[PDB]
Chains A and B, each alone.
With several copies, the nearest count.
Chain A
Amino acid sequence: DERQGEMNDKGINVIRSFTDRGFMVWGARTCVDAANISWRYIPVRRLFNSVERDIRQALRAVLFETNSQPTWVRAKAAVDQYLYTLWQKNALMGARPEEAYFVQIGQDITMSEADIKQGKMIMTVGLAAVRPAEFIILQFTQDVV
């Protein structure tokens, strides 16, 4: 345990051997600078990899359609119908699904006239992931009453 306290903060996970359970993988951090607490875990980095990998798969039915207002309202609905299923399976923490995600796309919300005339479309996806519990602390007192 005392050698692991530097390696895990460094970003090196460790397979640690417990006898009654076996060779368990122990550690879910990533090789990142320890000040960056946003991407400080594996799944917070790996879910955001997997969301945008399946959003590009879902946005490919949008590309060479015409650039106007009914094209955005189909592209906004495609990521809204995708992120709602991730909210269903408890991938995003929250209680009501306007908190777990938001998609903002529009004429003046995210773009300009010279932006659309070039032919590109920008939307802002943002989603709140669940952070796991690394450390636990058991506080054994003795005065019950």
Chain B
Amino acid sequence: TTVTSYPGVYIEELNSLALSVSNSATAVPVFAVDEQNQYISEDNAIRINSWMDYLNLIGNFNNEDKLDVSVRAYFANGGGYCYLVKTTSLEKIIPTLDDVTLLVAAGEDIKTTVDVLCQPGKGLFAVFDGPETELTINGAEEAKQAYTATPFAAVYYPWLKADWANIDIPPSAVMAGVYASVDLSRGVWKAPANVALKGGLEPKFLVTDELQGEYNTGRAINMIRNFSNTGTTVWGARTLEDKDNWRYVPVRRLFNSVERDIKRAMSFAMFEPNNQPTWERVRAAISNYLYSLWQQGGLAGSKEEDAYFVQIGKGITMTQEQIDAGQMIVKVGLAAVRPAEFIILQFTQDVE
């Protein structure tokens, strides 16, 4: 910044700002910040709207900091405004904060926080990192149980390396960019795997397929790895829980992207006279949201009556004692899409 005295043109140089484009999407990563960082105050959540706004905060860029190489790889891939929260006060600020859809362990250990923070009632989907050491087929039972089995988290193992950085780059940095770059392009219901990594990011450790056969079962660890045709890409779409209800992240992330957009679609119903004309104004405010989600290919099926259902009413879902307690119970069902993980190729030699 130069002071301006005369009206005209100023030719002042500024070497190597490493400038990225501003982006707009609907995915807001709370970034965990280690306590030894100085340009953060605790019990406070500062907001970073673009890479120039982070670079205004820290002053100048250095590739030593585990946070500085983290938010560059975030804004190089997906962008979108992010919240930088220090770790020791992250349990107070995330319930405070609205616009929180995914909590990113930048380079820190959050496994004690996610157990109390991520709940079925909330709307978060945390992501954190695998081990930064190499792990083999033999150590498949040890590092798998180092994480909890909640269906609201995803683990990406191979830490990144880039030519512009010195410390290894943690993969939950880039995977919050990938979650925000895929939701804009292909929507939420498509899997955030099988997509390229921009910004010159490269995996540290080469992963074989026979290694990934043991980290996909149970408490799964998704992995990124480079291929010959396209380069480095994400190659996992499994959450930690291995029940069929929440096995894939696109199922868990759609139901979390549905609820945050239903509860703002029918937030007019608060403190309204609780009778019947409030109810059909509620079942119609949900039903032409889900139909607009139905036509874009977000749910599976072929009709609108195999796709979803909204059923409310006195006696259908709520009792008379629930009316004078001030409760409107709503039952909504969905049928999302599942991705195709495996493709097998049968090679007959004799053509008929």
In the complex they form, whether A and B have CB atoms below 8 Å apart is answered with: yes
Residues in chain A within 8 A of chain B (CB atoms): 1-2, 17-21, 26, 28, 37, 90, 93, 130-145
Q: Are A139 and B327 in contact (CB under 8 A)?
A: no
B255 CB-CB contact with A under 8 Å: yes
Whether A18 lies near B259 (C-beta < 8 A) is no
Which residues of A lie under 8 Å from residue B331 when comparing CB positions?
Answer: 139, 141
How far in angstroms is the closest Cβ of chain B from A77? Answer: 28
4 other contacts beyond A1-B95, A140-B259, A145-B306, with CB at 8 A cut-off?
Answer: A133-B270, A136-B327, A136-B329, A144-B306
B264-290, CB < 8 A from A: 264, 267, 269-275, 278
Q: Which of B263, B272, B301, B335 contacts A138 (CB 8 A)?
A: B263
Query: Does any Cβ of A come within 8 Å of B326's Cβ?
Result: yes
Contact sample, A vs B, 23 pairs, CB 8 Å cutoff:
A1-B95, A2-B95, A19-B98, A93-B275, A132-B273, A133-B269, A133-B272, A133-B273, A134-B327, A135-B325, A136-B329, A136-B330, A137-B330, A140-B332, A140-B333, A141-B331, A142-B245, A142-B255, A142-B334, A143-B333, A144-B308, A144-B333, A144-B335
Of A1, A17, A133, A137, the residue contacting B278 (CB under 8 A) is: A133
Chain B count of residues within 8 A CB distance of the other chain: 37
B333-A142 in contact (CB<8A): yes
Q: Which residue of B lies closest to A130 (CB)?
A: B273
B334 CB contacts on chain A under 8 angstroms: 140, 142, 144
Chain B stretch 314-352: residues in CB contact (< 8 A) with chain A: 317, 324-335
A21 contacts which of B95, B267, B307, B335 (Cβ < 8 Å)?
A: B267
Interface contact B271-A133, CB-CB below 8 Å:
yes
Q: Cβ of B330 and Cβ of A139 under 8 Å apart? A: yes
Q: Whole-angstrom distance between the alpha carbons of A141 and B335 in the complex?
A: 9
